[PDB]
Amino acid sequence: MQKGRVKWFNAEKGYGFIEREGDTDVFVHYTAINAKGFRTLNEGDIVTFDVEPGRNGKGPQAVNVTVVEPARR
């Protein structure tokens, strides 16, 4: 799969973007976040995820998203 760093996540609106090294940002919707304790992401979180075709049209879209390191804000 892929890892990345969350660039921004609007907790109110339920979506954000994950930055990838040398690659385009990936859109992430809250429905894509695995049930492992966190219902949101925070800027700075390290995450793992896959990418698959999606319906959203905000760039490539992440699925199966899991926090690795929550942000050390």
Side-chain angles (χ1 to χ4, degrees):
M1 294 143 47
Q2 294 179 56
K3 59 176 179 87
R5 172 184 185 282
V6 176
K7 186 191 274 207
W8 170 85
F9 190 90
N10 181 313
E12 186 68 16
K13 284 190 193 183
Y15 64 79
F17 291 97
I18 296 158
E19 184 184 4
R20 296 194 285 185
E21 153 193 332
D23 214 342
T24 201
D25 295 341
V26 173
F27 170 70
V28 52
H29 191 248
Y30 69 95
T31 55
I33 299 173
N34 289 326
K36 289 155 179 295
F38 297 113
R39 303 234 152 222
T40 66
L41 309 170
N42 271 17
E43 174 184 22
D45 290 346
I46 310 296
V47 292
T48 60
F49 52 98
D50 287 316
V51 169
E52 60 177 38
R55 210 141 51 158
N56 276 73
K58 293 167 184 296
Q61 161 176 296
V63 299
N64 186 22
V65 179
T66 304
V67 176
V68 174
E69 292 174 63
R72 340 64 150 123
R73 330 188 325 193

